[PDB]
Every structure is written in structure tokens, then in C-alpha cells.
């Protein structure tokens, strides 16, 4: 009996398929600890996975009901079931993956007695290494690496089967493309002429392909190395599933290819180019506020959040849990909590444009050695979409967008900057007083109108940049000077200063008791905070579900407080108030009501917002 073997390895195909069928029908072990992005399915809207069944048999119900066409295969479960199969999967992905697919399709057809539009496809994931640690032994093996997405290409059509037509008698033949090659017919079987066919391109069949560029994480590296970049190829349904600015983990096959010395000729260079063929993208990360509009939270944790919101301590409880290693600065922590929550979104949905800004901007200004950079680092690490820039390390064009000439098409093309990557996120700008004036002056349009309009050679367009700006700086003399006023210790234009919603003056209150307490706190690092898992869910639920509106009493109160602000700002040696500060007060009031999970802004919320704004600046 003829039998099929993988070339040079003595692996037979069917004996693997038997064990994998057993794995699919039988595995139920890990379901006590189901993961965050894997514990829900759906027939319509959303539904929750049951523990007690065979797990992938349960997951196949989603393919029947919601007509999903893929299964995410966690390889840790397979390794727990049988290492003898896990080794074969990792060692020969280019040979065994075309048959585990067929076992899945067989089990689906047997279970449901049904067909589908496309075959159910496998995506193995969660097999980790570094980009520099790859060797020639790893060619065609399964690997997984992580990084940030900087750029994505436009789509490329890749043919799978061509269509020939005879020039003499209009007969037509199909021809499969395989091993990278097509076979051309020579003799027409109808009219019996030779060397006679012509390929018709638009009658043939193509597939999608995309190129994605990935960058090293800087954390793990040894001494003196600069970060590397790698090309990742996405085929089929993975195409356009990721944006620039996202942080991801990729599982795929590591490959190597040759290159021609001249494009005209058959000779090849003996040093090969390398890339990755993708199989799975993962973006789930539990160390940050989650990136998914909070769709998957359970009813029980929603009720726990609703119960937690009724503490009178809710502002202090949420605020002091942020940045736990930082001592005191409670007012600054409350300001950062307001930055995290934000106001109500106010967009034109016909044009997809912001009518009014709802993001909150904060400046910190104070003495040296007061942990401003540390607070910036905490906010940078907490959020999913964040950028960090510092001092003279930035340019005006690099902060916003740049024009460069393309490598092959020789056209001028446009590419992103920090504020465009930080869209729906936070940009942290350290050493803000030491930037070049050219670099600092482009921030006006972004900080006010949340858009960015460009007019250079052949490029006239407008971009959206819905970012929040958090900045830190020193006074003119690096130590705060008491022989000068506030608008002389700070020196920025009024056009720039009026665009911040909060300014925090941090001046060293020199006192022996405060010195002793802070010294005890700092020395102890060498020897009722809300849980991070609850804080994540609280912020996401509040953002998705709470939209405060102003009450009429609150609106009258806001007008009265704005008149008081206009009188107070006019005195000598003080920051003047413009009509922009009325918008700032409305944003802060909505943020306080949003923290309380209230659909209406009250006079108490306006009072708390005004008190925070006033006491931030009276130093």
C-alpha cells in the first residue's frame, strides 16, 4: 500500500491526525483559568464560555452560530496534552499545518452536518525570543517575538491560478500557480496550433498580502546595542488588523530567501534576506488600561464597580492608587486622574470631526528634585497609546508629520509623527522649557482644534490628532525665585499658556518635619489602594457608559464663577484669564461627574472643579 511521508524525516501524516482528533474531542483541563480575551463567544451580541465541556468543541459552536472562520489555538494546552505532538508542530510548521486544518474541518462537518463559505483556519499562538538571537538553525521553525508597529503598506495582489486563452480560436484553460511557478500550455487541444496562448490577467484569481514593519523593544538589550527592525508578512484575513502606534506580539514562521545579483540575470547572492510569515497577532496586555472599549466585562464585576462608586472617598481612593511610590502631591494626583477620565466626546458624526475639544492638558512647573519626570513616566507606562519625548530630542516636523521621497516610486510621501501616533492617547513632553521655539510653536493647532493641516509639494490634506498633552518644566532661573512674580518665573507666550487646562506650581516648602517624613519614605524603599484589575475595569466602564450633561443651576453657577475668574486674573503679576478658561471649567466639571458615574453635572461638581483649578495655581 502506497504511503505518504514528509521528505527525509519519516513522519507519516495520518498518525498525527489521529492524536490531534483526540486532543480536540477530549481536552478540558485549563478551563478553570480561562483568559481575558478568550472567555467570551457569541451567537449574537456576546455570551460567556462554559467551563465543563471539551474546550475546542465549545469554541466550534461560535463557528456554527456567528459564522467565525478561525480558531485561536493556545499552544500551552497542546503542550500539556502531549509534548510529542507539540515538538512536531513547532519543528515542522510548513508541513503539518495543512492537515491539522483538515482534522478541524472534519470534526466541524461531523458535529454540525453543515458547510461554510471558507474553510475554518488555524492560528497557533503563545509558543519568546529576541530579534538578535536568531540563527540559521531556526529557518522554517515557529517563533514568536514582540514590538511596536510603525508602518503598514498598501495591499498587494498575489496570484494563485492563471487563465490562458488561445489567440486563434478563443478556447480557454485554467492553470494553477504553485511552488511560486506557473506552467504555460503549448498546444491548443481544440484547433491544434502551437505556441498560441495568451494570459488574460483580469480573468485570473488573486489574494491579499500586506507588509508590516516591527521595531525592537529597548528594555531587554545588552550593552551598547541599538534597536533593530523586522519585516512581517500578513496574508488573508490578518490584513489591515493593526495600526501604526500599536504594541503587539507576533507568532509566525522564520524564513530566508535569496536575491538576484542583477535583475536581468539568473545569478544569486550567497547571503540571504530574512523575514517573518505571520500566523497570529496578539495585543492583549493586563499591565495597562485595556485597549478594547470594555466590551468583555462580566455583570458581576460591573456590579462590583457600581458598588465601589458609592464610597464618599472615591476621589482619594482612585487618585492615591495611581503612582503608589510617590509621596504626597495629592492635588497633582487628582489632576492626573482628571486627565485619565476626560470630558464628554462631542463629534460631528456625518463628517467624523471634533466640534469641541474634550481632552485635558496639564503643565507641571516647579523646583528641581520634585519627581515631575517620575509622574510623567507613570502616566507613560499606564496607558495603551502613549508617547514620551524630551528636550531637544524632538523637531517640529518629527512631532507632527514628515515628507520624504519613496525608495522605488520616487514620489513624495507623508509619514506620521508623535502626536499622530498618540491619537486617542497621551503625549508626554519632558524638559518643555528647553525645546527649540520652532519645535514648541507647532503645538497650538493640535492643542486647540485637535486637527493638523498640511500644505507641501503635491500633498494637501488634514489629519486628526486627538491627543492629551502632559508637560513638565523648570522656571527661568532653575530654582524658583521669590523676588519675581508668577508670570516672570514662568516665561511662555499667553497664546501657549491659555491652552492648558491645569497649571501646577510646585515650590519647595522648606520644613524639617516634611524633610524627615520624605527621608523616611525614600530610605524605606531599599529595605486601601484599589487593585489594578479593578481600576482598569472602572476606567473603561466609565468611559464607555457615562456621558454627563449640565444642569441649568450648574450653568448659571459656571457663568458667575467665570466672572470671578476674569476679575481675579486682572491683578498685577498674575496669569490673565480668557474666554478659553470657561471651556476648561466645563471640561473639569464633566470629568468630576464622570468619576462619580453620574449622568448630570451638579453645583457640587462645579465647586470641586473650581476649587481644584484655583488651588493648583495659588502658590
Amino acid at each position: 500500500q502506497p504511503r505518504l511521508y514528509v521528505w527525509g524525516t519519516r513522519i507519516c501524516v495520518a498518525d498525527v491526525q489521529r492524536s490531534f482528533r483526540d486532543f480536540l474531542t477530549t481536552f478540558k483541563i485549563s478551563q478553570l483559568a480561562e483568559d481575558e480575551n478568550m472567555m467570551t463567544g457569541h451567537d449574537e451580541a456576546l455570551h460567556e464560555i462554559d467551563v465543563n465541556h471539551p474546550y475546542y468543541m465549545e469554541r466550534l459552536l461560535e463557528c456554527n452560530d456567528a459564522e467565525v472562520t478561525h480558531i485561536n489555538l493556545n499552544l500551552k494546552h497542546l503542550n500539556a496534552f502531549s509534548e510529542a505532538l507539540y515538538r512536531k508542530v513547532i519543528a515542522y510548521p510548513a508541513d503539518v499545518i495543512p492537515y491539522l486544518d483538515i482534522v478541524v474541518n472534519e470534526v466541524f462537518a461531523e458535529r454540525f452536518n453543515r458547510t461554510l463559505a471558507q474553510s475554518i483556519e488555524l492560528r497557533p499562538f503563545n509558543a519568546t525570543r529576541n530579534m538578535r538571537g536568531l540563527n540559521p538553525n531556526d529557518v522554517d521553525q515557529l517563533i514568536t517575538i514582540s514590538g511596536m508597529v510603525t508602518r503598514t503598506s498598501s495591499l498587494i495582489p498575489e496570484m494563485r491560478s492563471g487563465y490562458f486563452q488561445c489567440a486563434v480560436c478563443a478556447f480557454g484553460i485554467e492553470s494553477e500557480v504553485d511552488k511560486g511557478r506557473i506552467e504555460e500550455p503549448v498546444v491548443c487541444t481544440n484547433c491544434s496550433n502551437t505556441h498560441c496562448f495568451q494570459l488574460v490577467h483580469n480573468r485570473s484569481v488573486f489574494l491579499d498580502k500586506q507588509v508590516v514593519k516591527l521595531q525592537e523593544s529597548p528594555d531587554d538589550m545588552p550593552s551598547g546595542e541599538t534597536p533593530h527592525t523586522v519585516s512581517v508578512y500578513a496574508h488573508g484575513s490578518l490584513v489591515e488588523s493593526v495600526q501604526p502606534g500599536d504594541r503587539i506580539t507576533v507568532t509566525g514562521i522564520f524564513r530566508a530567501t535569496g536575491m538576484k545579483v542583477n535583475p536581468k540575470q539568473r545569478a544569486l547572492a550567497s547571503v540571504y534576506r530574512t523575514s517573518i510569515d505571520a500566523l497570529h497577532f496578539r495585543k492583549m496586555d493586563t499591565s495597562r488600561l485595556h485597549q478594547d472599549n470594555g466590551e468583555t466585562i462580566t455583570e458581576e464585576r460591573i456590579q462590583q464597580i457600581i458598588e465601589l462608586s458609592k464610597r464618599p472617598d472615591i476621589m482619594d481612593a482612585l487618585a492615591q492608587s495611581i503612582a503608589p511610590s510617590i509621596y504626597e502631591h495629592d492635588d497633582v494626583k487628582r489632576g492626573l486622574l482628571c486627565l485619565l477620565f476626560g470630558g464628554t466626546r462631542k463629534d460631528d458624526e456625518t463628517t467624523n470631526k471634533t466640534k469641541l475639544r474634550s481632552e485635558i492638558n496639564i503643565l507641571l512647573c516647579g523646583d528641581p528634585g520634585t519627581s515631575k519626570s517620575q509622574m510623567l513616566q507613570y502616566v507613560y507606562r499606564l496607558l495603551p497609546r502613549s508617547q514620551y519625548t524630551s528636550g531637544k530630542g524632538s523637531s517640529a516636523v518629527g512631532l507632527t508629520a514628515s515628507v520624504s521621497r519613496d525608495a522605488d516610486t520616487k514620489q513624495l510621501v507623508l509619514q506620521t509623527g508623535a502626536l499622530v501616533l498618540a491619537d486617542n492617547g497621551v503625549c508626554c513632553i519632558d524638559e518643555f522649557d528647553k525645546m527649540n521655539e520652532s519645535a514648541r510653536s507647532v503645538l497650538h493647532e493640535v492643542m486647540e482644534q485637535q486637527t493638523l493641516s498640511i500644505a507641501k509639494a503635491g500633498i494637501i490634506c488634514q489629519l486628526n490628532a486627538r491627543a492629551s498633552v502632559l508637560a513638565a518644566a523648570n522656571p527661568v532661573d532653575s530654582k524658583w525665585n521669590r523676588n519675581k512674580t508668577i508670570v516672570e518665573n514662568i516665561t511662555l507666550p499667553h497664546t501657549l499658556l491659555s491652552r492648558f487646562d491645569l497649571i501646577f506650581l510646585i515650590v519647595d516648602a522648606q520644613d524639617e518635619m516634611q524633610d524627615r517624613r520624605l527621608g523616611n519614605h525614600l530610605v524605606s524603599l531599599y529595605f486601601e489602594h484599589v487593585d489594578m484589575n479593578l481600576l482598569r475595569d472602572y476606567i473603561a466602564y466609565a468611559k464607555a457608559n457615562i456621558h454627563p450633561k449640565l444642569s441649568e443651576e450648574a450653568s448659571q453657577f459656571i457663568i458667575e464663577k467665570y466672572l470671578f475668574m476674569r476679575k481675579a486674573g486682572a491683578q498685577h503679576g498674575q496669569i490673565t484669564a480668557y474666554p478659553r478658561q470657561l471651556e476648561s471649567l466645563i471640561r473639569l466639571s464633566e470629568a468630576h461627574a464622570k468619576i462619580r458615574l453620574s449622568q448630570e453635572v451638579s453645583v457640587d461638581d462645579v465647586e470641586k472643579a473650581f476649587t481644584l483649578w484655583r488651588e493648583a495655581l495659588k502658590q
Partner: protein
């Protein structure tokens, strides 16, 4: 050069026909043709009416034309429903065929050309029987240019209801006013003349008119075509057909093709003569007419020249000088003639037969007559034409299957049909039937051929042996059949 036109609309020839008939000059031409005194115009008028009916068939005009636009709208919507569903199913099958990654594999148990080697494949094959030994690459061998089959193309279309109604009226008026006088005046002269083409026009017009009368069932018109009903018609037709076949076989080149073209039209006219005489003998109301038809049918069945004609033509067939249309016509002619001989044996009217030596009378046996067609030189062309089963007409498919079925189950001799070149046809038919559900298979028009292939292959595999599988590679003669059987 003016453009390409579909097969279901009016030809450019039809517009000239419309102008010609709207002028009414055809009535004057018919009036001239009716006069016995004006003989010199008659051959040309016959040529004119044949050239008018050049692009038509009798089946187009025989059915009376009627329509309702409600039914037409419903019918066209169902046609495009068929087209849309075919496209969606084909595209989803093709896009589901593809597979993602590659590799290379060894088929353990199959030998390679080079020593100690197993077979190697470079695509993820589903199962070992899907392997093909890369026959898709290899270039097909061609016949030389002198020996390829060729069709003869007549621009043939389903014209509009207006043109079909006008032509139907013209055909009926010709039969009523001209036909007997015109044919009687022509037959004395057409074969004496120097010019060749009026012979072809003569045979074409005979074939068209007799088929139109039989299919339209206008039985009162049978008096008007009485010039063609006699035994003399069969005699004269047989003489001309024999001369054309001999010249086409013995000459070479375009001259041989030119004589074979005459032979084709003569054969078609002969077939219409046979079918018309059977229709008269079955459905005429007057017993005198029935007796007149019956005596002619008995003459055809009795005399050796009419009974030996199909084998005589089949043994001389050659694709260098005769068209495929000739072979299809010959197969259908043989089918109808053998049905006539079978009925005249079954009713007992044929028992003893005259044979040349002096002439002597010997008993006749229908199985002895059928056994002549089991020769290899006949069965070659039946297997040749069975390859085109997916585009043959249903009548031709029935004729081919019936001739094979007689040898399979009336003479009961399946060893002569055990042959590889027929098993290839069965393989194609089976692949065609895989794409249909069990109900649609019984609904299909090819189910007769499928069922016959089923029974013959089961009879083959009932007693399979390896030496029998070797014997399937060659055509088997009579002693070969005896020694294989015994």
C-alpha cells in the same frame, strides 16, 4: 468584418430575404416554374429557392410560431437564475481548493525512473490517488495536417418569428404550386450538365421538402410530392451516391473533398426517402397508398444493394476526405435502416433472400446480419464519435448506445467491447456525473449512457484477471475471442 452576431437573431441574409419576399417577385417566379413550356428557366429557379433556404432547417419552420410575453419573461428570469447559481458554486469551489503552505513529500511504495528511488511530490497532496505523474506538463502529440478531422460550417440560427412565418408560407406555396413540375423537369438535365453545383441544390431541396412534410404532418400535401415516392427514386439516388463515394475515395486532394461533398447530400436525401415511406405506410388513410408504400419498403429490404450499403461506406470512410457531418449522417441512416429490417423480420415478411452467384435463394438470419457490424473496422468509428457525448444531440447518443447495446446483449458477446479506448469514455462520463445529486443524475439526458457503462463494467469486473487486463489493450479478432472465452 461587420461584427459578430448571436445565434438567436436574424442573419444579414434574412434582410435580403425580407426585401425579396416583400416585393412579391417570388409569385412571378413560381408562376414561371409552373409552365411546362418555359423549361430553360426551371433549373435556375430550383437553384434560387435552394439558395433562399440555404441557412434554414426544417425543424425551424415545422412548428407553428406562437408566444406570450408573460411566459417569455418568466423563462428568461429562470435562465439567468441558472447562470448566477453556476457562477457562485464554481467560484466558491475554486477558492476553497487552494492551500496555504508547501513542503515536499515522498510516496513510499512507488518507484522512480532512477535506481533505488521513491516518488517525490512538491505540493500538499490530500491522498496518494490524487497524484498524476505530472501529465499536465507533457505536450500532446498531433496528427499530421493531411489527416485531421474537419467540420463543414453552415451559418445556422434561430431567426425571428416574422422571418420564420414568411418562410413557412413560402414553403407551403412552393409545395402547392411548383414542386412536381419542377422536379420532373430538373431530373432529366441536372446530371447531364457541365456545371456541378445544381446536383447539390437538387439533393438539398429534396431533403428539406420531404422532412418538412413529415414533421409538419400536413398529410393532404402528400399528393403534391408524388414525383419522389416511387421505387425509381431509390434506384436513381443509389446510383448517384455510389458514383460519388467511388470518386471521393479514389481521387486525391480538393477534388476528392469536392466529390465527397456531393456524397454527403445524396446520403441525407436517401435517409429522408426511407423515413417518409415509413410515415406513409403508418399514417396514410388510403389502403392503395399504403400498398404502394409497402411494396417499395419490401424492395428495399429484399435487394442486396440496399442491405449492403452501410458496411460498404463505413469500410471506405477516411477523415482526410470526408467530414464529421458525413459520419454522423451515416450513423443515423444505419440506425433507421436496421430498425426497418428488424420489423420486417419480426413480422415474418423476410425469410428467404436472393443472392448472386446466376441468382439463388437462401434463408436469412437477422443475427447473422447484425454480426457483420461487430467488425473492428466498424466499431472504431463508434468509439470515435462517443468521445463527443457532452455536445452530441440526444438522437445521435441514442443511436451510438443502441448499436453497442445490440452487440453487448442481443448477440451476447461482451469480449469484443472490452477495450481501453471505450473505458476512457466511461471514465469521462463518470467524472461528469460526479457533479450531480442522486435525483439530478436520473433527471439528466446522459443517464442512458451512464447506465450502459455501469452494466458493462460490472460484467467486466465480475471475473477480472490480469491477463484479461492485458488483453484489453488490443482489438480482438474472432479466434482471439474464441480462445479468450474458452
Amino acid at each position: 468584418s461587420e461584427g459578430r452576431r448571436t445565434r438567436i437573431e436574424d442573419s444579414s441574409h434574412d434582410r435580403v430575404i425580407i426585401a425579396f419576399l416583400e416585393s412579391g417577385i417570388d409569385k412571378t417566379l413560381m408562376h414561371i416554374a409552373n409552365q411546362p413550356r418555359e423549361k430553360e428557366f426551371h433549373v435556375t429557379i430550383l437553384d434560387i429557392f435552394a439558395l433562399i433556404l440555404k441557412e434554414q432547417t426544417a425543424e425551424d419552420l415545422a412548428t407553428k410560431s406562437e408566444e406570450v410575453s408573460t411566459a417569455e419573461q418568466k423563462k428568461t428570469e429562470e435562465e439567468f437564475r441558472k447562470i448566477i447559481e453556476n457562477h457562485v458554486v464554481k467560484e466558491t469551489q475554486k477558492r476553497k481548493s487552494f492551500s496555504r503552505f508547501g513542503g515536499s513529500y515522498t510516496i513510499k511504495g512507488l518507484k522512480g525512473i532512477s535506481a533505488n528511488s521513491s516518488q517525490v511530490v512538491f505540493k500538499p497532496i490530500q491522498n496518494v490517488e490524487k497524484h498524476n505523474f505530472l501529465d499536465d506538463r507533457k505536450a500532446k502529440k498531433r496528427a499530421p495536417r493531411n489527416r485531421r478531422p474537419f467540420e463543414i460550417d453552415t451559418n445556422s440560427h434561430f431567426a425571428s418569428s416574422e422571418v420564420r412565418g414568411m418562410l413557412r408560407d413560402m414553403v407551403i406555396r412552393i409545395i402547392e404550386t411548383c414542386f412536381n413540375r419542377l422536379m420532373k423537369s430538373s431530373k432529366t438535365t441536372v446530371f447531364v450538365q457541365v456545371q456541378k453545383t445544381s446536383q447539390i441544390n437538387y439533393f438539398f431541396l429534396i431533403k428539406f421538402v420531404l422532412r418538412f412534410v413529415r414533421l409538419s404532418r400536413q398529410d393532404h400535401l402528400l399528393e403534391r410530392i408524388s414525383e419522389c415516392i416511387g421505387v425509381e427514386a431509390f434506384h436513381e439516388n443509389n446510383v448517384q451516391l455510389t458514383e460519388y463515394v467511388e470518386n471521393a475515395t479514389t481521387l486525391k486532394g480538393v477534388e476528392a473533398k469536392s466529390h465527397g461533398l456531393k456524397a454527403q447530400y445524396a446520403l441525407g436525401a436517401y435517409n429522408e426517402l426511407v423515413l417518409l415511406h415509413r410515415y406513409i405506410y403508418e399514417h396514410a388513410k388510403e389502403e392503395n397508398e399504403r400498398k404502394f408504400a409497402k411494396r417499395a419498403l419490401e424492395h428495399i429490404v429484399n435487394v442486396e444493394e440496399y442491405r449492403e450499403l452501410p458496411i460498404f461506406i463505413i469500410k471506405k470512410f477516411s477523415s482526410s476526405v470526408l467530414s464529421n457531418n458525413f459520419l454522423r449522417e451515416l450513423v443515423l441512416t444505419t440506425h433507421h435502416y436496421m430498425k426497418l429490417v428488424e420489423r420486417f423480420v419480426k413480422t415474418g415478411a423476410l425469410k428467404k433472400v436472393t443472392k448472386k452467384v446466376k441468382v439463388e435463394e437462401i434463408d436469412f438470419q437477422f443475427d447473422s446480419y447484425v454480426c457483420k457490424f461487430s467488425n473492428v473496422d466498424v466499431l472504431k468509428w463508434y468509439v470515435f464519435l462517443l468521445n463527443d457525448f457532452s455536445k452530441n444531440s440526444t438522437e445521435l447518443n441514442q443511436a451510438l448506445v443502441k448499436m453497442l447495446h445490440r452487440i453487448a446483449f442481443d448477440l451476447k458477446l461482451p469480449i469484443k467491447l472490452y477495450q481501453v479506448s471505450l473505458f476512457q469514455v466511461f471514465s469521462k462520463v463518470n467524472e461528469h456525473f460526479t457533479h450531480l445529486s442522486k435525483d439530478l443524475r436520473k433527471s439528466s439526458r446522459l443517464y442512458e449512457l451512464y447506465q450502459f457503462g455501469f452494466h458493462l463494467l460490472k460484467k467486466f469486473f465480475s471475473k477480472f484477471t490480469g491477463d484479461l487486463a492485458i488483453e484489453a489493450l488490443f482489438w480482438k479478432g474472432p479466434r482471439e475471442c474464441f480462445e479468450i472465452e474458452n
